[PDB]
Design an enzyme around this catalytic site. Structure first.
Site, mmCIF file in Angstrom:
data_model
loop_
_atom_site.group_PDB
_atom_site.id
_atom_site.type_symbol
_atom_site.label_atom_id
_atom_site.label_comp_id
_atom_site.label_asym_id
_atom_site.label_seq_id
_atom_site.Cartn_x
_atom_site.Cartn_y
_atom_site.Cartn_z
ATOM 1 C CD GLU A 33 31.713 22.453 -26.316
ATOM 2 O OE1 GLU A 33 32.199 23.443 -25.697
ATOM 3 O OE2 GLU A 33 30.515 22.427 -26.699
ATOM 4 C CD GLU A 43 41.288 23.993 -27.503
ATOM 5 O OE1 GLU A 43 41.393 25.164 -27.097
ATOM 6 O OE2 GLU A 43 40.642 23.115 -26.894
ATOM 7 C CE1 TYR A 70 39.448 20.845 -29.031
ATOM 8 C CE2 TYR A 70 39.729 18.606 -28.242
ATOM 9 C CZ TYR A 70 39.912 19.969 -28.067
ATOM 10 O OH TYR A 70 40.528 20.422 -26.922
ATOM 11 C CG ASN A 106 33.644 22.827 -21.482
ATOM 12 O OD1 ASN A 106 34.833 23.118 -21.546
ATOM 13 N ND2 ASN A 106 32.893 22.770 -22.573
#
Length: 202
Positions: free
Chosen positions: A179, A88, A79, A47
């Site tokens: 991401e 978040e 983000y 990740n």
């Protein structure tokens, strides 16, 4: 020339704040380029998330351009974080084979920057955050159809979120991020402020 990093850190490069994080599974390279640009490559990554932007987020006409590629679970999103409350958040413009957050926690819709987005709220329990191990909500706007490059007028998203009882705290960072999760791909993204554009006219 470029500066290519492989370990989590923040900084300022080309005049822009950046944040980069990875869990260290698989491979990922985050290459800082001139101005608002970064490139990335990832292969069988565990990740990672990272991009260029602002050390302090807020209401902004974000403008970005470039390319984003994946054969798997990756996405391209503004983000960022707030504190008090700890949130978040994601404004997702494109993705690979999995549209985040897999439909979980649907709240509504918002129109911004020429396109419709779906709004979601999900929760992270006892999870690492910018304030350590915490329980916090994640707020999402996810474009109904993929787009790579455009303006993201953050206030439109924040205001829709607020209309659904999804309230924000004090702004921490806000970056135009790539991401990846158990996936492979590449990106090349240049961030700018969109406020210096000619006035819209049709």
């Amino acid at each position: 020339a470029q500066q290519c990093i492989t370990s989590s850190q923040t900084g300022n490069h080309g005049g822009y704040f950046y944040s980069f994080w990875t869990d260290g599974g698989g491979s990922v390279s985050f290459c800082l380029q001139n101005g608002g640009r970064y490139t990335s490559q990832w292969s069988n990554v565990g990740n990672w998330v990272g991009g260029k932007g602002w050390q302090t987020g807020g209401r902004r006409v974000v403008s970005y351009s470039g390319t984003f590629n994946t054969s798997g679970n990756s996405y391209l999103a503004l983000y960022g974080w707030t504190t008090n409350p700890l949130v978040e958040y994601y404004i997702v413009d494109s993705w690979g084979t999995w549209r985040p957050p897999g439909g979980e926690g649907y709240m509504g819709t918002v129109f911004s920057d020429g396109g419709w987005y779906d709004v979601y709220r999900t929760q992270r329990v006892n999870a690492p955050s910018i304030e350590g191990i915490r329980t916090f909500y994640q707020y999402w706007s996810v474009r109904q159809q993929k787009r790579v490059g455009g303006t993201i007028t953050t206030g439109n998203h924040f205001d829709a979120w607020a209309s659904y009882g999804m309230n924000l705290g004090t702004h921490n960072y806000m970056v135009m991020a790539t991401e990846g999760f158990q996936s492979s791909g590449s990106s090349d993204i240049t961030v700018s402020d969109g406020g210096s554009s000619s006035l819209e006219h049709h």
